[PDB]
Amino acid sequence: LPGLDSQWRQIENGESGRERPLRAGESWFLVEKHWYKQWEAYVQGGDQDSSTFPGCINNATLFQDEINWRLKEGLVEGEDYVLLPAAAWHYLVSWYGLEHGQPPIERKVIELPNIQKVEVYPVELLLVRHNDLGKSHTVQFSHTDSIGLVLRTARERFLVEPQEDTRLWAKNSEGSLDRLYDTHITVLDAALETGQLIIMETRKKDGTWPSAQ
């Protein structure tokens, strides 16, 4: 079997383990809480031949029935079980092995229906140009609005000619900066907050961008 650090990093990393975002169609598996916590103790224990060896995966307290292997109901994530992506699960099974007679507990990700709601508190943003950070335009956007729309909005409110070249910057929190190069994601997909600063940047006649020398 791989090293402890190898197992841990293979199970707990993002996009290859537990910290994978939920994507529609992807399969996830269940591991009983105590077994997983024992595995965590073993891997983080600093010894491979320790007595904290979890052994075969055991989800006996998750099944209502031993004959049909029907999942118990009312089980909560974090309390009774822990979810593992297909990859990490397969690795665990290849390493420690599933208990004999037991089926893998597999479920899939689904996209819940779109809930409608009245947006009482829109994202109030202050639109600002690179050349004048004192001269601003306060505009309200929706959480579901696209960043391209925000770009066009800043372009409209500051009346910039189409021959001119513009880019979008976002001032996360109070000081932190982050470039906004994606024009196909929503405001909610941008971590924008009310009162935040959005800096629209226009290329100079030199062919240079104010941030790029």
UniProtKB/Swiss-Prot annotation:
- The residues covered by the DUSP domain are 2-110
Modified sites of kind N6-acetyllysine:
K171
Give its localization: Nucleus; Cytoplasm; Chromosome
Query: Where in this protein does the record put region Disordered?
Result: 1-19
Q: What does this protein do?
A: Protease that can remove conjugated ubiquitin from target proteins and polyubiquitin chains. Inhibits the degradation of target proteins by the proteasome. Cleaves preferentially 'Lys-6' and 'Lys-63'-linked ubiquitin chains. Has lower activity with 'Lys-11' and 'Lys-33'-linked ubiquitin chains, and extremely low activity with 'Lys-27', 'Lys-29' and 'Lys-48'-linked ubiquitin chains (in vitro). Plays a role in the regulation of pathways leading to NF-kappa-B activation. Plays a role in the regulation of DNA repair after double-stranded DNA breaks.
By sequence similarity, the record places it as follows:
Belongs to the peptidase C19 family.
User: What quaternary arrangement does the UniProt entry report?
Assistant: Monomer. Associated component of the Polycomb group (PcG) multiprotein PRC1-like complex. Interacts with RANBP9/RANBPM. Interacts with BRCA2. Interacts with CHUK/IKKA. Interacts with NFKBIA. Interacts with SPRY3, RAE1, MYCBP2/PAM, and KCTD6.
> What name does this protein carry?
Ubiquitin carboxyl-terminal hydrolase 11
